[PDB]
Structure formats: structure tokens, C-alpha cells
Amino acid sequence: GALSLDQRIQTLAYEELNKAVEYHQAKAGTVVVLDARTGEILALANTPGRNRAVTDMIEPGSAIKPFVIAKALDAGKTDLNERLNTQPYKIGPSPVRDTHVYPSLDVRGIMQKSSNVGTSKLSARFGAEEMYDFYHELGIGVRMHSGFPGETAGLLRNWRRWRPIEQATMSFGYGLQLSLLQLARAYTALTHDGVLLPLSFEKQAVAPQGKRIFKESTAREVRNLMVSVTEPGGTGTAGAVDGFDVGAKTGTARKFVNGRYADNKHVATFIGFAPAKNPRVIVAVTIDEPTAHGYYGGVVAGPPFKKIMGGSLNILGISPTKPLTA
Ligand SMILES: *C(=O)[C@@H](NC(=O)/C(=N\OCC(=O)O)c1csc(N)n1)[C@@H]1NC(C(=O)O)=C(C=C)CS1
């Protein structure tokens, strides 16, 4: 069977990843590029050393939020008109707080601004066991059986052990662990009209058997919300691509070092798809411990996402949906 890898995309992803890691004087980085319609793995790139894309568990951080928001919409726990109070709070020593105090936000705003408070409130409308099953259905804790040695399953703690604060902090991506490949896979539920794809290392003549996570209508509405992330007002404007609308999500995760979360060491993540309305490509970028030129997901991982996505669309012959201006 024809290998799914596209050499030009692989080269592009590798070169842009290593350029970004150098520019930000980071420890390491990883990129996954997927066919958004059939789940072909087009590129898997790493900084020198092991195949971190498949071997390394990371916390998804705010890259989990699109799924929580989609689930809440899908189940009718919220809608596109609700305006949620998003003031911060604590339970005991644990804060539930955003980068800024947003007094209130609608679901679009929660996505756009990356509101931990907003996402936690939507998650809290579901029971713990329901959320556990949901995360497991996204593939968290479920090995890909890629064939690569040292491949990780990720980690999903048994729901019977969860404190109520833990369900909340999981909704903005603490505690959950998965590889970047497992995380990129999850995004196929949003691009492939609600249906999670298994991913493939060979070209597929038709979409393989998947599993429905969301209604098609939910997936379509969520993709539209995610375009807010790359437009003025969003966290991820650095990932906007000339000629296209891009649905994306940023993540900035405190690193866990010496038994505690560090306040000044982070992992920067940017995951997105285009064309947003009718997606063809998913690009996932993570940069571990940037020490120069910033640390926010949008600022650090946005620019390489932009280059890799723009280049991939061109390589694949996908036409711009709006006039070019660059
Ligand atoms: C999303 O990733 C979410 N991030 C956090 O809540 C985390 N840390 O915040 C940064 C800090 O210094 O406290 C976090 C989640 S899991 C983990 N280990 N850390 C929000 N998203 C973004 C973003 O890029 O979209 C943020 C940007 C600064 C922080 S809040």
C-alpha cells in the first residue's frame, strides 16, 4: 500500500519545527500533520532524539477545550446564545482562573479567549463518569499501536478517584496525558463531521470505519467558533494563513518539574485545521520550554503552524477561499 507520508510536507514540518525551536531556544518540539478527511498521517516531525510525537505523554492543556465545548453543545447543556459568568474562583487551595478576568463570555468567547473558568462550568454540567467515558472515547489512555517502540497509551485517571476540583482542572487540560499524535487524532472528530478517525500510515481510498463523537451540526458549529481563535480578539492570530479561514486552538501549559507545576516554564501548543468550513489538513505543533521570544502557545507555536499549514495546503493543491493579501 502507498505510504501516507508526504515527503514535501514532512520536510517542511521538520525544517519549520527546528527553526522555531532554535529561535525560541526551546528544549524540544513536535509536529503532526494529518489528512483531515481520511486520517492519513502526512508528517510526523521531531527535534533530534526520540519520536516524541508518539512516545511522549503531554498534558493537552487548553487544546482539550474544543472537545468539552463541543460535548456541552452536542448534549444540549449549553447553546450559542448563553452568556456565562466567567469570574474566577477557588476550591480550597486550587484556583479556577483565566489569564484575565472576563466578567462574562458566550461559548464563542470561551473558545476565543481560552477561558478556563467558562470551560470548567460547561464540564461541571456533566457527571464525573460521563466525562471520564468521553475522554476515553477521544482515545485518551487508548494506545494507537503505531508500531513505534516506546509508544505511549497516555493516562486517564479512574473517575472513582476524582475530586470535584479535578474534573474542573481536567477540562482545561491538567491531569490528562496523551501523545501529540493522540491529540491530533482527536481533532479528526471536529474535521470529519463528528466522526473520530483511527489514523492511517497508508493512503486510504475511502474514510475508514470511525466512531461518532458529535453530531455533524455540532462539529460544523464548533469549527466556525474556532475561527475566532485566529482572528483579531483571539489568542492565536499568529497562526492565521493568507487565503484561508483557519479553525484553531492555543495551549500554554505549566510544566511539571521537581514535583510541582512551574510558573515560569511552559509547553506551547497550537493545533488547527483549514479550510475551516471544509477541512483538508490538520497541523499540530508543540514547543517544549521556550526560553526566548515568549512562551504563549499562540506566540510560539502559531508561527510554525502558519508556515506548515500554508505550505501543506499549497503542496496538496488546495485553492484559497479568499483573496491573498501577502
Ligand atoms: C490553556 O492551555 C490554558 N492554560 C492553563 O490554564 C495552564 N496554565 O496557564 C499558564 C500559567 O502560567 O498558569 C495550564 C493548563 S494544563 C497546565 N499544565 N497548565 C489557558 N490557555 C492559554 C492559551 O494559550 O490559550 C493561556 C495563555 C497564556 C493560559 S490560560
3-state secondary structure 52-98: HHHHCCECCHHHHHHHHHHHHHHCCCCCCCCEEECCCEEECCEEECC
Cα-Cα-Cα-Cα dihedral of 16, 17, 23, 28, to 10°? -170
Cα distance between residue 100 and residue 234, in whole Å: 13
Q: Name the residue of 113, 171, 252 whose CB sits within 8 Å of the most ligand 1 atoms, as the mutation to test its pocket.
A: 252
Among residues 178, 64, 184, 181, the alpha carbon closest in space to that of 122 is found at: 64
62 among known catalytic residues? yes
Q: Which three cell numbers stand for residue 294?
A: 515568549
Instruction: Please indicate whether residue 99, judged by its CB atom, sits closer than 6 Å to ligand 1.
Output: yes
- Tell me how far the alpha carbon of residue 315 lies from the centroid of ligand 1, in angstroms: 33
Phi, psi of 57 (to 5 degrees): -75, 130
Cα distance between residue 87 and residue 104, in whole Å: 7
CATH topology for 1-326 is: Beta-lactamase (3.40.710)
Cα distance between residue 234 and residue 226, in whole Å: 9
Cα distance between residue 269 and residue 264, in whole Å: 16
Eight-class DSSP state of 292: S
Place of cell 485518551: 140
User: If DSSP codes are grouped into helix, strand and coil, which group holds residue 289?
Assistant: coil
